[model samples]
Target: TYSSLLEEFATELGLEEIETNELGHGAVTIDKIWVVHLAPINEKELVAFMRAGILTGQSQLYDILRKNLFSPLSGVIRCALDKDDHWLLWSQLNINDTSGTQLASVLTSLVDKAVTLS
Candidate 1:
């Protein structure tokens, strides 16, 4: 897991209380930017994001993330199940560089919008 990167970048992202467990789950937060689950995928050699969940039912909000979504180091925001009902800004990153902080920034902005919508 990219525990260190998440922990180190927590301050940079204004997030604290970074915690990672042996069960392959980690979490940190700041204000409303709640993040979770940095674990491996299908026996793969890297770790990516796995959100607990986020807001639901917002067209413009979802579109912003889709518009900003792109390649590596920048996680693509998505709904957990790709359903508009339980819509969320998911971060699936291959944490190998300084992408964690970038992802965290996106997460914070996403949560900001989410809070506003709610």
Candidate 2:
């Protein structure tokens, strides 16, 4: 059961060469997960991988904080993963127009802290 679930999730994420270890009781342990190693043509590709992971994690933290602040508006906020830059940007252009200062301050602070810790 666990193996099937792991396979399904990996497939959905379009990941290949997945390896798993069974930890008993039908539970599978993700002992080591890796992607196909490819030669990067430039620095951009290498940075893309590093920045993408950082942005993804930051975006998730932002979402958690957003939920606690304004749960009702949580459903409307969305994070867009930029594949090229390996960054996540929020999509709330309308909010920028309506509450420019408030939204800007919030986002600015969040990004600043993310970078500081990173």
List the global CA lDDT of all models.
0.51, 0.33
Report RMSD (Å) for each prediction in the order shown.
Answer: 4.9, 17.4
Q: Tell me the spans in candidate 2 whose CA falls farther than 4 Å from its real position.
A: 1-70, 74-78, 93-97, 109-117
- Expressed as tens digits, the lDDT of each residue in 2-116 for candidate 1 is 6566665666766554666675566544454555445544332333333334454446556655666455544545544435344344555555544556656656655654454
The superposed Cα distance between candidate 1 and the true structure at residue 46, in angstroms, equals 7.0
lDDT for residue 14 in candidate 2, whole number 0-100:
65
Q: Model 1: how far is 94 from its true place, Å?
A: 1.8
Cα lDDT tens digits, model 2, 1-118, are 2334334534545656246333211211221321111112232211001122244444566764565444444213333345553434232323212232333343444344334434
Runs of candidate 1 exceeding 4 Å displacement: 13-17, 32-73, 81-85
Q: TM-score of predicted model 2?
A: 0.27
